Design a protein around this ligand. Structure first.
Ligand SMILES: [Zn+2]
Ligand SMILES: [Zn+2]
Lengths: 245, 102, 98, 148, 56, 90, 146, 72, 116, 56
């Protein structure tokens, strides 16, 4: 009748209680009832399926309360300090014209409301009209360790190809795909701002993920294995540097 | 010294299935006047759909600051796609879903 | 609850490979003006492309899901109003037999 | 109204056409030239290379014992070729970029004079963009003009 | 007793008919809410009031 | 053979589940039995194996928990984790 | 209330109409902007009736808006007293016209002495938010209770 | 017959055929077994390669990589 | 409100006042593309929004098992087989007026007896 | 619950328990009753936790 399903350490029967956490790689939208200038927040915790355990999270913010005009949209980027508008990021992804931007965000030409709320972002996107000036803009905005501009434009492009949206993939050339996904997130944010969809519920049990011994021992054995490799290499460098056997 | 050879050549772009494409890594196309097929060598015949009729702003070039030898081939004439004893191909497609590790 | 279990996670690669064989257009070739009524396909939150026939494709994936080819732990949802089709094969989900 | 626990005894007591051939070009021409694709991003339907005028030019623009990380092959060869090409005259500008995803399976059916066709496997595919239509910019002038 | 059980069944049944009638009048957009609340709030107050009245 | 299927909480949003099989599937009373719902819904895609399975391990020991209030089921579910008994034979 | 005016509903309706906050946005169904260069003549064929009446150097740009008659009832208002409020708000820089209560469509039009559209849009925000038609601040939903 | 509809009590049999297969605590055993089977090889193979860069004045290098892990 | 885009530039056409002929125009500030005006309307706010209540209506709406079924006949084809659902516009002041969707001609006829 | 239809405003589907403790309860009613019980326990716990601080 012994069901098993536990461990034995130092003669003690230890049990690993199932942990509970939230899921990732899902676009979420929430409201802000505080006097903050941000009205709706589009959070999305991006991470790979296996390895590294990514924590970077993308956020697309909608500024301006209801009633007031000039409600622009600005999304934050990792390693970049201040927030960057969505249209400028679209310029940095290779899409220069604005009709294509409105074609990626809103998928219905008959609807005039979303396109109407896109106007201020098309104005700031009119201020910066070039892809190279957008790459230099994100290069000058965040991460000042590049010093040189020629390395900060290519470094910013590598940020847009690697750190920007870790999921899907991290190779070069997938900027069109990420442009469509970004326009999808903006479509969900503005579509949630038009009172057509309720705030995303976090209490839905389907959006929750449990962790048994598998994931826990995966994180633990992963970190311990990394430390093991680092220590072994440390012994290698000590051996070749001190010149011994 | 880039030179456009002709560009007048008309080329058709094809999206092939993976086994025949990797096999190509000869047949006879039968144009039926708005439905065209393909009689491969023994083996199957394949209907190729007129994927995109008008296909402008698309061309084909080849290659023989660092300038290199560039040659222009021809214009793209029609966007196409090959469509498919099909039970064996369906079983092979069901059979590819059986990959495992040691 | 007495019949509740926790998923373990499978491999999404054979499913993504199987979708493109029935005409699943990639995402980079998408034009909303040439295909407005196309149903978006989502695999673990990743948008790989759309498809202009979600009925026959969904019936195929369901029939192949009931025969035992695809792991039953994978949960597939087809939101009609949202016009989406989410596919979840990640570990941690709690399911129950019915 | 009671739990039936005698199921062991109950179960024990109960049980016109036109055919044209295809051919594979010898691999010598495939070893001489690599076939790439062209796709424009200017919305204008026509835009041929004859209307692109001439001369058309497409050209590509102390420490002790330590540690290295690593990297693989094809990704490194694609990473070292980070110089995109451009086609111009002497003015229209077209600057292309890689597409990568549209590799997969792409076979070319080049039509010759006869009804037969010549199939060539596509190496890569690039998206050309018409650059510098309006002709304007600024850099620091736009960084100071955006601070108003 | 039996007759009391039938009187309870009819009591609840009458309240169910009332909630169905107010439900049809609300779906037909024939009921205007009072000042201070909306249509859904007044409808829920009427349904809850009828159910608590039948239970009491 | 395609006779039973697992369903999480995400797919549960897009299915219609029936409680009892022989009470809600076929199409059409003693006053001691409880009053149930009707079978006006036709598009039943799935059916519950048995409702008594929604309870946990501790609540399963409760006799007739339907006729008992919920907080008593919780208190009994808490006292069931400390009663004297025989855990194993070894 | 006062002991003299007790058990009276109309008096309480006057008190409620004297303290309950009301704004111009409350009565507004929609607004729209038009380019109409000639100050007097209007391209719009309907509003011509208004043009005929309310008339008998300025901005070519027109700001126009429509009110809910039900809002004009629930919150007792007069197109006249509204136009009075705006006129005594912006004073003379903004010319004003408003439709009659008899009109089955409530219309209000306004003009001014880069593009004029942006100026009008600013004035739109001021109109909706910063105008209170009647009632003292921070008072809502006055409920009659016996 | 064999094609007759089932009843409410019959469902209990199904539940039996469930607990005979899984067991009351099968999620921990399946998750742990899958961890031992695949997670070990995945963690070992995902970051096994480490190289030392040696300089001399002719360049030199060294490498250590982990392969198939073995459990006892 | 339903503005156009430039040619080649594809940028939005900001309104430009024509003081010479005194008429509205549509310009692109990047280039020199200015087209005439077919309407004096420029901006419409529309405060009280009533659209979006019937959102998300698809050709395959009749195959939804989660949706209910009614027996009321259509005013057009007179088909008693239809699927009804309330407004899709989610808001506090949204009425509970049903929306009937016939399963034959795909017509959307409501149940409001006051205003139709 | 996923056992009823969408846009259902009937009182039975919205939480009305027409059965009694003498004849048992249905699952869709026992679930809501469990929600009310857990809510009662949580509310009592919070009222006590704040009652102590107020007392001090
Ligand atoms: Zn332009
Ligand atoms: Zn009809």
């Amino acid at each position: 009748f012994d069901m098993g399903g536990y461990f034995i350490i130092n003669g003690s029967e230890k049990v690993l209680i199932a942990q509970e956490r939230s899921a990732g790689n899902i676009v979420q939208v929430f409201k802000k009832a505080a006097p903050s200038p941000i009205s709706h927040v589009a959070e999305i915790r991006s991470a790979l399926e296996k390895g590294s355990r990514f924590i970077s999270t993308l956020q697309v913010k909608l500024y301006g309360r209801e009633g007031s005009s000039a409600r622009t949209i600005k999304a934050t980027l990792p390693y970049i300090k201040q927030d960057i508008p969505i249209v400028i990021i679209f310029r940095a992804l290779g899409i220069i014209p604005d009709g294509e931007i409105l074609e990626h965000i809103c998928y219905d030409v008959n609807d005039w409301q979303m396109l109407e709320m896109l106007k201020p972002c098309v104005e700031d996107g009119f201020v910066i009209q070039d892809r190279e000036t957008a790459l230099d803009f994100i290069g000058r905005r965040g991460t000042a360790l590049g010093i040189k501009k020629e390395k900060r434009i290519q470094y910013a492009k590598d940020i847009l190809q690697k750190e920007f949206l870790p999921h899907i993939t991290q190779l070069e050339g997938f900027e069109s795909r990420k442009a469509f996904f970004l326009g999808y997130m903006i479509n969900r944010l503005l579509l949630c701002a038009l009172d057509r969809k309720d705030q995303d519920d976090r209490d839905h049990f389907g959006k929750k993920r449990l962790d048994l011994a598998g994931p826990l021992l995966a994180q633990l054995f992963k970190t311990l294995f990394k430390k093991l490799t680092k220590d072994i290499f440390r012994y290698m460098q000590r051996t070749v540097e001190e010149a011994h056997d | 010294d880039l030179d456009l050879e002709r560009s007048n050549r008309q080329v058709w772009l094809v999206r092939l299935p993976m086994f025949l494409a990797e096999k190509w890594r000869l047949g006879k196309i039968r144009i039926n006047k708005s439905k065209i097929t393909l009689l491969l060598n023994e083996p199957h015949e394949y209907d190729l759909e007129l994927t995109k009729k008008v296909v402008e702003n698309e061309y084909v070039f080849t290659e023989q600051t660092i300038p290199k030898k560039t040659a222009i081939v021809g214009t793209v004439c029609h966007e196409c796609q090959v469509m498919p004893y099909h039970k064996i191909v369906e079983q092979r497609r069901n059979i590819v879903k059986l990959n495992n590790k040691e | 609850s007495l019949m509740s279990c926790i998923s373990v996670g499978t491999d999404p690669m054979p499913i993504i490979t199987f979708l493109s064989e029935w005409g699943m257009e990639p995402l980079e070739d998408y034009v909303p003006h040439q295909s407005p009524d196309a149903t978006r396909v989502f695999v673990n939150g990743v948008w790989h492309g759309v498809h202009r026939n979600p009925a026959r494709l969904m019936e195929t994936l369901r029939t192949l899901r009931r025969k035992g080819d695809i792991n039953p732990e994978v949960s597939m949802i087809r939101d009609i109003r949202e016009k989406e089709l989410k596919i979840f094969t990640d570990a941690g989900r709690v399911y129950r037999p019915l | 109204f009671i739990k039936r626990d005698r199921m062991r005894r109950n179960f024990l007591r109960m049980r016109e056409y036109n055919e044209f051939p295809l051919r594979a070009i010898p691999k010598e021409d495939l070893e001489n030239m690599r076939t790439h694709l062209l796709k424009f991003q200017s919305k204008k339907k026509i835009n041929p290379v004859t209307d692109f005028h001439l001369p058309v030019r497409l050209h590509r623009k102390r420490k002790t014992r330590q540690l290295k990380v690593l990297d693989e092959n094809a990704k490194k060869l694609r990473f070292e070729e980070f110089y995109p090409w451009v086609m111009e005259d002497f003015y229209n500008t077209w600057v292309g970029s890689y597409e990568a995803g549209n590799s997969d399976s792409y076979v070319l059916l080049s039509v010759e004079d006869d009804g037969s066709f010549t199939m060539i496997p596509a190496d890569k595919v690039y998206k050309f963009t018409a650059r510098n239509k309006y002709a304007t910019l600024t850099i620091d002038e736009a960084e100071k003009r955006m601070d108003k | 007793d039996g007759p009391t059980m039938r009187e309870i069944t009819e009591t609840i049944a009458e309240a169910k008919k009332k909630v169905l009638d107010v439900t049809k009048e609300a779906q037909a957009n024939l009921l205007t809410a009072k000042h201070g609340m909306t249509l859904r709030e007044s409808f829920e107050d009427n349904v809850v009031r009828f159910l608590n009245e039948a239970r009491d | 053979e395609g006779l039973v299927e697992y369903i999480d909480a995400e797919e549960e949003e897009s299915i219609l589940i029936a409680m009892q099989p022989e009470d809600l599937e076929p199409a059409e009373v003693d006053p001691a039995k409880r009053i149930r719902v009707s079978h006006h819904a036709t598009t039943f895609t799935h059916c519950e194996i048995h409702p008594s399975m929604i309870l946990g391990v501790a609540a399963s020991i409760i006799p007739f928990p339907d006729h008992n209030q919920s907080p008593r089921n919780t208190y009994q579910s808490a006292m069931g984790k400390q009663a004297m008994g025989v855990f194993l034979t070894n | 209330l006062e002991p003299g005016h007790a058990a009276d509903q109309e008096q309480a309706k006057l008190i409620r109409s004297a303290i309950e906050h009301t704004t111009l946005k409350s009565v507004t169904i929609a607004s729209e902007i038009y380019y109409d260069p000639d100050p007097r003549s209007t391209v719009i064929p309907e509003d011509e009736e208004i043009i005929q009446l309310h008339f008998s150097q300025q901005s070519p740009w027109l700001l126009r808006l429509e009110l809910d008659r039900a809002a004009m009832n629930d919150k007792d208002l007069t197109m006249g007293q509204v136009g009075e409020r705006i006129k005594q708000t912006f004073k003379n820089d903004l010319f004003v016209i408003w439709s009659e209560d008899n009109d089955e469509k409530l219309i209000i039009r306004c003009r001014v002495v880069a593009e004029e559209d942006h100026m009008l849009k600013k004035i739109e925000n001021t109109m909706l938010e910063n105008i209170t038609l009647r009632g003292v601040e921070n008072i809502e939903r006055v409920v009659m209770m016996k | 017959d064999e094609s007759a509809p089932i009843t409410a009590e019959d469902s209990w049999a199904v539940i039996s055929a469930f607990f005979r297969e899984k067991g009351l605590v099968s999620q921990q055993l399946d998750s742990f077994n899958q961890f031992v089977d695949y997670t070990l090889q995945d963690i070992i193979c995902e970051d096994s390669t480490l190289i030392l860069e040696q300089l001399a004045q002719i360049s030199r290098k060294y490498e250590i990589s982990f392969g198939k892990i073995y459990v006892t | 409100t339903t503005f156009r885009f430039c040619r080649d530039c594809n940028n939005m056409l900001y309104p430009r006042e024509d003081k010479e002929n005194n008429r509205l125009l549509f310009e692109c500030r990047t280039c020199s593309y200015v087209e005439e005006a077919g309407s004096p309307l420029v901006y419409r706010h529309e405060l009280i929004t009533n659209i979006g209540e019937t959102a998300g209506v698809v050709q395959d709406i009749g195959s939804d098992p989660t949706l209910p079924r009614s027996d009321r006949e259509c005013p057009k084809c007179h088909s008693r087989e239809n699927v009804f659902f309330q407004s899709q516009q989610r808001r506090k002041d949204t009425s509970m007026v049903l929306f009937f969707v016939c399963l034959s001609c795909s017509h959307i006829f409501t149940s409001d007896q006051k205003n139709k | 619950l996923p056992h009823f239809s969408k846009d259902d405003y009937s009182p039975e589907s919205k939480g009305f328990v027409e059965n009694s403790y003498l004849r048992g309860l249905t699952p869709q009613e026992f679930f809501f009753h469990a929600m009310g019980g857990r809510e009662g326990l949580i509310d009592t716990a919070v009222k006590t936790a704040e009652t102590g601080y107020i007392q001090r």
